[PDB]
C-alpha cells in the first residue's frame, strides 16, 4: 500500500529514495519506526510444561 | 567539586612513572591560589 511497490531502482532515483531501498519501516513523525520480531510458543501444538 | 577536570587518557612512555602530561589547555584552565613573597615575586609578576 505504498507508491514504491514494483518500482525499479531507476524510478526510485527519479524519486528521492536511494536506488536499493529496502522498505519495512513505518515512517512516524519522520523517524523510521519498525516492529521487532518477537518469539512465541508454537501454534496449536499441545506442548507440555 | 571545584577545580577538577575530566578527560580521556592515552599512553605515553617518554615522560616518567610519576608524571602526567596535561595539554596546555588544562594548563590554562586549572589554577590555584598562591601568596606572593620576596623570592617568588619574579615568577608571579611574570605569570600575571
Amino acid at each position: 500500500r505504498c507508491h514504491l511497490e514494483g518500482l525499479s531502482p531507476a524510478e526510485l532515483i527519479a524519486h528521492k529514495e536511494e536506488s536499493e531501498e529496502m522498505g519495512g519501516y513505518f515512517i512516524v513523525n519522520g523517524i523510521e519506526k519498525l516492529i521487532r520480531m518477537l518469539i512465541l510458543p508454537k501454534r496449536n501444538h499441545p506442548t507440555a510444561i | 567539586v571545584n577545580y577538577a577536570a575530566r578527560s580521556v587518557i592515552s599512553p605515553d612512555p617518554n615522560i616518567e612513572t610519576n608524571e602526567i602530561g596535561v595539554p596546555p589547555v588544562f594548563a590554562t584552565k586549572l589554577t590555584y591560589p598562591e601568596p606572593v613573597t620576596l623570592y617568588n615575586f619574579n615568577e608571579m609578576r611574570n605569570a600575571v
Binding site: 536506488s19 519522520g30 501454534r43 496449536n44 | 580521556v8 592515552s10 599512553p11 612512555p13
Partner: protein, 440 residues
C-alpha cells in the same frame, strides 16, 4: 519435493498437492521421550530454511521440528549412507548476514567474532547514497571507503559494494613506537594527512515556532526580521535577511542560527547553536506546515561537522581488534621495507596472543597477496581444510608475487637507519573506523 520441482519449472502450476512450507514432524516413539505422534503443520509465521534432499537432488524446506529428528549431513563428504537423508547446501548458510562477512571467521576465538559483529554494526560507514534528502538527527559518512581486498563472496552477493565501511590499511605488526601498548596503535602521519579515514557528521536540528504558541492567541511568531533595526555584530553576519542562515557559513559555539520575531512585541528573538564544535551549514528546509495555506512554521538546518582522525578515535579491524589512534607518528620516523612503503598503521604484536585473532594474520597474508596480483581473495568460512591450509595457499600466491612466503618483510628502522634484526610482518588489512568517540 517432487511436485515442487515440477511446479518451479515448465510443468503446470496447479494448486500444490502438498506445499513446500508444510513440515512433516515425525516424532518417533521411545521410552521417556517426546510424546510420539506425526505432526503436520501448515500455519504461517514459522521458521523454515532450505536444505538439499539427497535421494532426489532438489530443494526441500524444513523447520525447527524436523531438525531434531533428521540426519542433515553438513557436507557432500560427511554423508554416511542409509541414514543421512539431507544435505546442507553450504554450511555458510548457518551464520547471519553481518556475521558471515568476517573474512576467515572460522579462525578466530568465537568471542572475537562476537565482538566483531557487535562492533561492525557501529562503524562510521556510508549510511547510503541519498543523504541530501534525509531528515535524521545524526548521520555519519566516510569520505574515503573502499571494497575489502579480502572478502567473502556474499559481500558481493548481498550488494555491499554500494555501502563501503572502511579502507585498506598497510598494517605492520610491530612493537617499535612504544606508544602502542594496551591495545592502542599508531597512524602514519602523512598517511593521515593524505586522507585516511575521514569522517563527516551531519547534525540536522529542527526549529518549530508552533511550540512557543501556548494558547489563546492566533499564529504570531514568524521567521525573518521585524521591520526595523537588526544588530550587525552577529545577526547580519550569518543570517541572510530572512532569519535563515547562509548556506556554507562556518558556525562556532556561540553563534546565532535562526531568527524570528513576535507580532505584538515586534522584537526579534534568536536561537543559538548549542553544540560545542565548529560546524558548517549545508542545507536548510523551509517545511511547509501542512496541506497548504500556511506560513513557514518549521525549519530544518543540516550542519556538516567534520571529524578527521583525532587522538582517541577508535579503529578496529574485522576481527575485534579495536584500538585507539595513539600518537600519529611522523611518516619519516616510521619503518620501511626494501620497497619503501611506510606502514599506514602500526599494530602491536602483543595483542594477538590471548586474543587468538589468527584470522587477522591470515587476512594480512591474503591482503598482501590479493593487492599484488589484483585478485579479490575469497575468504568464505569453512573452505580451507586441514590437508592444505589457507596459509599455504596465500603463501604460494605471495612467493609467486615475490615477497616472503611466511609474510615477513625486511624492514629498516627510521630513527636509526640500519635494518631491524628480525623481519617484520606487513599486510593489507581492512580497517573500518569506529564512531564511539562521538561523546568524548
Amino acid at each position: 519435493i517432487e511436485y515442487a520441482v515440477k511446479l518451479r519449472n515448465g510443468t503446470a502450476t496447479e494448486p500444490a498437492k502438498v506445499p513446500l512450507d508444510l513440515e512433516i514432524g515425525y516424532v518417533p516413539p521411545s521410552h521417556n521421550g517426546q510424546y510420539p505422534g506425526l505432526y503436520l503443520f501448515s500455519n504461517p509465521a514459522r521458521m523454515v530454511r532450505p536444505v538439499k534432499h539427497i535421494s532426489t537432488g532438489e530443494l526441500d524446506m524444513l523447520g525447527p521440528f524436523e531438525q531434531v529428528y533428521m540426519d542433515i549431513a553438513c557436507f557432500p563428504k560427511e554423508i554416511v549412507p542409509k541414514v543421512s537423508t539431507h544435505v546442507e547446501y553450504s554450511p555458510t548458510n548457518v551464520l547471519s548476514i553481518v556475521a558471515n562477512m568476517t573474512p576467515f571467521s572460522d579462525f578466530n576465538q568465537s568471542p572475537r567474532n562476537m565482538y566483531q559483529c557487535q562492533m561492525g554494526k557501529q562503524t562510521m560507514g556510508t549510511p547510503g547514497t541519498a543523504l541530501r534528502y534525509r531528515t535524521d538527527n545524526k548521520l555519519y559518512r566516510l569520505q574515503t571507503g573502499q571494497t575489502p581486498v579480502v572478502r567473502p563472496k556474499l559481500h558481493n552477493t548481498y550488494g555491499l559494494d554500494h555501502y563501503p565501511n572502511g579502507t585498506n590499511a598497510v598494517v605492520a605488526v610491530i612493537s617499535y613506537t612504544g606508544y602502542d601498548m594496551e591495545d592502542a596503535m599508531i597512524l602514519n602521519k602523512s598517511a593521515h594527512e593524505r586522507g585516511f579515514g575521514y569522517g563527516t557528521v551531519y547534525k540536522g536540528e529542527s526549529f518549530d515556532l508552533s511550540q512557543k504558541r501556548r494558547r489563546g492567541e492566533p499564529v504570531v511568531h514568524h521567521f525573518g526580521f521585524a521591520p526595523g533595526s537588526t544588530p550587525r555584530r552577529e545577526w547580519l553576519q550569518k543570517l541572510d535577511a530572512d532569519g535563515l542562515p547562509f548556506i556554507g557559513i562556518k558556525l562556532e559555539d556561540g553563534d546565532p542560527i535562526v531568527a524570528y520575531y513576535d507580532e505584538s512585541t515586534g522584537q526579534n528573538f534568536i536561537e543559538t547553536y548549542h553544540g560545542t564544535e565548529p560546524g558548517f551549514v549545508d542545507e536548510v528546509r523551509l517545511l511547509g506546515n501542512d496541506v497548504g495555506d500556511s506560513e513557514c512554521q518549521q525549519i530544518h538546518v543540516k550542519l556538516r561537522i567534520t571529524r578527521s582522525p583525532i587522538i582517541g578515535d577508535k579503529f578496529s579491524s574485522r576481527h575485534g581488534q579495536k584500538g585507539i589512534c595513539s600518537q600519529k607518528w611522523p611518516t619519516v620516523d616510521m619503518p620501511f621495507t626494501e620497497s619503501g612503503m611506510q606502514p599506514d598503521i602500526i599494530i602491536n604484536p602483543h595483542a594477538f596472543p590471548s586474543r587468538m585473532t589468527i584470522g587477522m594474520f591470515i587476512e594480512s597474508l591474503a591482503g598482501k597477496a590479493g593487492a599484488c596480483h589484483g585478485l579479490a581473495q575469497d575468504s568464505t568460512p569453512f573452505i580451507y581444510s586441514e590437508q592444505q591450509t589457507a596459509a599455504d595457499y596465500f603463501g604460494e600466491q605471495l612467493v609467486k608475487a615475490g615477497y616472503n612466503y611466511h609474510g615477513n618483510e625486511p624492514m629498516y628502522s627510521g630513527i636509526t637507519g640500519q635494518e631491524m634484526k628480525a623481519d617484520i610482518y606487513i599486510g593489507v588489512v581492512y580497517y573500518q573506523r569506529l564512531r564511539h568517540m562521538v561523546s568524548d
